Design an enzyme around this catalytic site. Sequence first.
Site, mmCIF file in Angstrom:
data_model
loop_
_atom_site.group_PDB
_atom_site.id
_atom_site.type_symbol
_atom_site.label_atom_id
_atom_site.label_comp_id
_atom_site.label_asym_id
_atom_site.label_seq_id
_atom_site.Cartn_x
_atom_site.Cartn_y
_atom_site.Cartn_z
ATOM 1 N N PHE A 207 0.689 -1.220 0.086
ATOM 2 C CA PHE A 207 -0.110 -0.068 -0.033
ATOM 3 C C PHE A 207 0.950 1.298 -0.107
ATOM 4 O O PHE A 207 1.912 1.364 0.601
ATOM 5 C CB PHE A 207 -1.116 -0.055 1.223
ATOM 6 C CG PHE A 207 -2.340 -0.688 0.917
ATOM 7 C CD1 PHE A 207 -2.138 -2.182 1.007
ATOM 8 C CD2 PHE A 207 -3.501 0.031 0.683
ATOM 9 C CE1 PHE A 207 -3.370 -2.983 0.686
ATOM 10 C CE2 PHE A 207 -4.497 -0.905 0.650
ATOM 11 C CZ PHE A 207 -4.657 -2.337 0.760
ATOM 12 N N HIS A 295 -7.688 -2.694 -10.545
ATOM 13 C CA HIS A 295 -7.104 -2.544 -9.437
ATOM 14 C C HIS A 295 -5.915 -3.552 -8.939
ATOM 15 O O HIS A 295 -6.204 -4.620 -8.818
ATOM 16 C CB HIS A 295 -8.064 -2.420 -8.132
ATOM 17 C CG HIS A 295 -7.338 -2.192 -6.969
ATOM 18 N ND1 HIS A 295 -7.021 -3.145 -6.082
ATOM 19 C CD2 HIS A 295 -6.927 -1.106 -6.270
ATOM 20 C CE1 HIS A 295 -6.420 -2.832 -4.819
ATOM 21 N NE2 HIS A 295 -6.522 -1.343 -5.023
HETATM 22 C C1 WCA Z 1 0.973 -11.638 -1.884
HETATM 23 C C2 WCA Z 1 0.923 -12.762 -2.582
HETATM 24 C C3 WCA Z 1 1.019 -14.099 -1.744
HETATM 25 C C4 WCA Z 1 2.416 -12.631 -3.301
HETATM 26 O O1 WCA Z 1 3.283 -13.449 -2.827
HETATM 27 P P1 WCA Z 1 3.838 -14.991 -3.707
HETATM 28 O O2 WCA Z 1 4.173 -14.683 -5.237
HETATM 29 O O3 WCA Z 1 2.474 -16.029 -3.915
HETATM 30 O O4 WCA Z 1 5.185 -15.627 -2.994
HETATM 31 P P2 WCA Z 1 6.100 -14.990 -2.300
HETATM 32 O O5 WCA Z 1 7.411 -15.465 -2.733
HETATM 33 O O6 WCA Z 1 6.204 -13.586 -3.255
HETATM 34 O O7 WCA Z 1 6.029 -14.565 -0.645
HETATM 35 C C5 WCA Z 1 5.057 -13.603 -0.166
HETATM 36 C C6 WCA Z 1 3.804 -14.458 -0.017
HETATM 37 O O8 WCA Z 1 4.243 -15.672 0.518
HETATM 38 C C7 WCA Z 1 3.047 -16.399 1.169
HETATM 39 N N1 WCA Z 1 3.580 -17.292 2.249
HETATM 40 C C8 WCA Z 1 4.081 -17.064 3.501
HETATM 41 N N2 WCA Z 1 4.479 -18.135 3.987
HETATM 42 C C9 WCA Z 1 3.951 -19.072 3.336
HETATM 43 C C10 WCA Z 1 3.811 -20.308 3.533
HETATM 44 N N3 WCA Z 1 4.209 -21.302 4.532
HETATM 45 N N4 WCA Z 1 3.338 -21.366 2.613
HETATM 46 C C11 WCA Z 1 2.746 -20.763 1.504
HETATM 47 N N5 WCA Z 1 2.844 -19.285 1.366
HETATM 48 C C12 WCA Z 1 3.362 -18.604 2.022
HETATM 49 C C13 WCA Z 1 2.432 -15.475 1.685
HETATM 50 O O9 WCA Z 1 1.013 -15.748 1.043
HETATM 51 C C14 WCA Z 1 2.878 -14.053 1.350
HETATM 52 O O10 WCA Z 1 1.794 -12.976 0.883
HETATM 53 P P3 WCA Z 1 0.897 -12.792 2.371
HETATM 54 O O11 WCA Z 1 -0.231 -13.346 2.452
HETATM 55 O O12 WCA Z 1 0.679 -11.193 2.133
HETATM 56 O O13 WCA Z 1 1.738 -12.776 3.876
HETATM 57 C C15 WCA Z 1 -0.212 -12.977 -3.930
HETATM 58 O O14 WCA Z 1 -1.188 -13.636 -3.255
HETATM 59 C C16 WCA Z 1 -0.729 -11.584 -4.035
HETATM 60 O O15 WCA Z 1 0.081 -10.775 -4.669
HETATM 61 N N6 WCA Z 1 -2.179 -11.205 -3.997
HETATM 62 C C17 WCA Z 1 -2.538 -10.278 -4.321
HETATM 63 C C18 WCA Z 1 -1.951 -9.062 -3.112
HETATM 64 C C19 WCA Z 1 -3.425 -8.566 -2.617
HETATM 65 O O16 WCA Z 1 -4.358 -8.670 -3.134
HETATM 66 N N7 WCA Z 1 -3.303 -7.814 -1.389
HETATM 67 C C20 WCA Z 1 -4.518 -7.105 -0.554
HETATM 68 C C21 WCA Z 1 -5.226 -8.459 -0.147
HETATM 69 S S1 WCA Z 1 -6.992 -7.765 0.406
HETATM 70 C C22 WCA Z 1 -6.672 -5.779 0.838
HETATM 71 O O17 WCA Z 1 -7.163 -5.080 -0.131
HETATM 72 C C23 WCA Z 1 -5.817 -5.539 2.001
HETATM 73 C C24 WCA Z 1 -5.040 -5.974 2.597
HETATM 74 C C25 WCA Z 1 -4.414 -5.643 4.070
HETATM 75 C C26 WCA Z 1 -4.523 -6.551 4.966
HETATM 76 C C27 WCA Z 1 -3.630 -5.982 6.216
HETATM 77 C C28 WCA Z 1 -3.074 -4.674 6.104
HETATM 78 O O18 WCA Z 1 -2.614 -4.208 7.345
HETATM 79 C C29 WCA Z 1 -3.250 -4.068 5.126
HETATM 80 C C30 WCA Z 1 -4.053 -4.451 3.872
#
Ligand code: WCA
Lengths: 382, 383
Positions: A207, A295
């Site tokens: 963000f 978005h």
């Molecule tokens: C964030 C992801 C997971 C990108 O990561 P990745 O490419 O799949 O893997 P990475 O190598 O980059 O490591 C990051 C991710 O790894 C994941 N991860 C870590 N531990 C593990 C593990 N044991 N096993 C499998 N995976 C793991 C984990 O999902 C973590 O993201 P997160 O959920 O935020 O913690 C992907 O789902 C993504 O980009 N999604 C779109 C992002 C998104 O929509 N964000 C907002 C969601 S809803 C919203 O509007 C507000 C949210 C918000 C919430 C709180 C706030 O304070 C502020 C805002």
Amino acid sequence: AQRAKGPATVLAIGTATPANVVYQTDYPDYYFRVTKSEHMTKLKNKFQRMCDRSTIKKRYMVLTEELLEKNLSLCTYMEPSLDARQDILVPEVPKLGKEAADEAIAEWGRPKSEITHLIFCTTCGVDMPGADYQLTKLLGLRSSVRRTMLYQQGCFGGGTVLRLAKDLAENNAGARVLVVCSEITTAVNFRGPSDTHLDLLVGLALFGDGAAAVIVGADPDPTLERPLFQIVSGAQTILPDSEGAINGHLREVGLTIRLLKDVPGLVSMNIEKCLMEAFAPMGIHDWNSIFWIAHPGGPTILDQVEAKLGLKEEKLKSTRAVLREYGNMSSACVLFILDEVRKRSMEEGKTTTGEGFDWGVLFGFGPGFTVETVVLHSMPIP
Amino acid sequence: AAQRAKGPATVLAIGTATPANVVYQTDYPDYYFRVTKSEHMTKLKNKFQRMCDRSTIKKRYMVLTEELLEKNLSLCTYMEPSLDARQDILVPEVPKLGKEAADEAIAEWGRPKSEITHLIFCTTCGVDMPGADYQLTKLLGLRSSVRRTMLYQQGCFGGGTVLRLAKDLAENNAGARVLVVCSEITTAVNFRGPSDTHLDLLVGLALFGDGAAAVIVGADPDPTLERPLFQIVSGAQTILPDSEGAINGHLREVGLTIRLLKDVPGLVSMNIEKCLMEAFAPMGIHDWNSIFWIAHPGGPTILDQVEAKLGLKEEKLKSTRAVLREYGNMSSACVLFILDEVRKRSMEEGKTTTGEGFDWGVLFGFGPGFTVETVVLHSMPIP
Ligand SMILES: CC(C)(COP(=O)(O)OP(=O)(O)OC[C@H]1O[C@@H](n2cnc3c(N)ncnc32)[C@H](O)[C@@H]1OP(=O)(O)O)[C@@H](O)C(=O)NCCC(=O)NCCSC(=O)/C=C/c1ccc(O)cc1
Ligand SMILES: CC(C)(COP(=O)(O)OP(=O)(O)OC[C@H]1O[C@@H](n2cnc3c(N)ncnc32)[C@H](O)[C@@H]1OP(=O)(O)O)[C@@H](O)C(=O)NCCC(=O)NCCSC(=O)/C=C/c1ccc(O)cc1
């Protein structure tokens, strides 16, 4: 008579950010130093890889290091901090909104005396009277302005304002709509120290702060005004089996947000129906014959949708570019991409405002889970 | 031809609902100062007691019972942490009371909920994500493709704010039928009496009650499926001159702290004639007794001063003061509570219209700004 003739049209788009530029390659170290959490090397390594894979290069933030020195409860997690955030948000959100609205009226070319309506949308802070009254006083709009306050809608407010401004402009003859979405994601900032809340970290790595504004009006006078996009329809839906996907509770510790669903997989498995139902009145089912604004909730939610739909790399270039140079700015983020879609369309000399294509989509994803799909039509570029 | 309706948005059904606990005004000065343990403030007590006796209120329905106070002691308390203690109440209880009213308005409507396309949910009470428009969508069983609009913290002028929004929603989208729910559980104000530094909460606690109202509004009503009641002709909103900080409600860790700087009865009186002149100018109407009246019952005096300055007959505010008498101030839902009353009274006595035998009528929402919302309505014939 009494009411407009043709469709709502966006006539100007202005953007505004704070002065503080914060590069992401430094934000992990900053965030664990400022929070005084240098000892938790597990979350540090985790938060580092989050920012590394967020595709973000820089972000603008009202929250300076000095503002945290004066508001030390924001260096805390579950300590009382609502007043410390609201003493910043209630003033700072209209201020950034005025900057973007002024850039938008500057492109508009017409005085503010003719702005009939105002739609203000923010997820940050809550007050009475609303930021729509603050913006009306700050901008010096007519006191006769009839306002709509969209409080705490989330990252899909950017499509909500377009779907609402269409009916406001089209059901009132000669009405012109000032639309402002200003979000300071100081609403989201807690102390790291929590293995009890790791989604807080992917929220802090994505963000940023910023404000966007557009001017909406029907039957534009093509001597003072230049049309950019016309809003043909605006839709809103609840995804199936999406209960509790994102839950945001506003407590004495601020807005605590918890995720239950895999949002990028939820958007991907359900977006094709939203494109089918919205583009059915035109007979369009090739989503690469369309210009795209979605978005950028994160890198992979666009990655997965780009893969599930089999889209070309060019479709989300502007979306990813706004996430790169500006990050996630919540609801205002889609209007930023609207502007980039128009700016890049001229910089690369394409036939129309939407990178060369006639029809276009605006996606806003937020709590619900809610998907706001808005279908626009481009304007020719000579 | 186009993809829009041809006529004006008309009110198609109305439904109201109030909680079960009834609290009579002739019993409120005592119970209030007992649960707060303030029987040592004889001044504020006599102060509060005279206020309750001059409120012209008989009863109010309230969600916050003494059973609820003993389990949330932070509400027997002025400015110690009390936000979560009300958040746990407002977040669920606001959509519940809203469905209670939306169920009765749908029953009178006579058409399935699948034909409810849009929704406006309005409350100044509480904040949650997703909003109360989502919780009602799930509770009421409306379609997932319902297009919703969340009016949070719009003050006591939300009743006209939503009529103005629902007018455009029903007049641009053809075949659209907009359900609008205003659900105000005004427990956000119940503060501990112990405050010589805050007398305005007293006269904020001696008036306000809980209630919810819901209307179905749509244009081109099928005269064989629907029955129109009022035509929402116009909707306006304006900030009164020299009203800076008239009603200020800040959201703090101890709740919503509201303080008043300007006299809002004299703020409404000195400006109500200009609003009515502008609103009825396209129809050449200048007799304000020629018009049926719905004014937001902020209190007895705001109505008294409007009636004095404009020189109205005592019958004009009969239903407004009757909703204020048996329900008190319920914020944005009051004018819609009054809307239900005028159509009941106008068929009680067999008047010519649904607005007490009058063609044109006005609905007023006064609130923070100072913002006044003026909605011109047209009555429909009754046999
Ligand atoms: C964030 C992801 C997971 C990108 O990561 P990745 O490419 O799949 O893997 P990475 O190598 O980059 O490591 C990051 C991710 O790894 C994941 N991860 C870590 N531990 C593990 C593990 N044991 N096993 C499998 N995976 C793991 C984990 O999902 C973590 O993201 P997160 O959920 O935020 O913690 C992907 O789902 C993504 O980009 N999604 C779109 C992002 C998104 O929509 N964000 C907002 C969601 S809803 C919203 O509007 C507000 C949210 C918000 C919430 C709180 C706030 O304070 C502020 C805002
Ligand atoms: C309250 C009034 C004055 C009617 O009372 P009265 O019959 O003329 O005089 P009383 O003998 O009954 O004594 C009570 C009132 O008399 C007034 N008064 C007392 N002491 C004196 C004195 N020394 N000298 C002159 N006069 C005096 C005083 O205004 C006090 O009310 P209050 O303002 O609440 O303290 C009148 O202002 C009135 O009813 N106005 C309409 C009510 C109204 O608009 N309420 C909403 C205002 S804005 C809003 O939406 C939020 C309000 C609120 C605010 C805080 C909350 O915690 C919660 C809610």
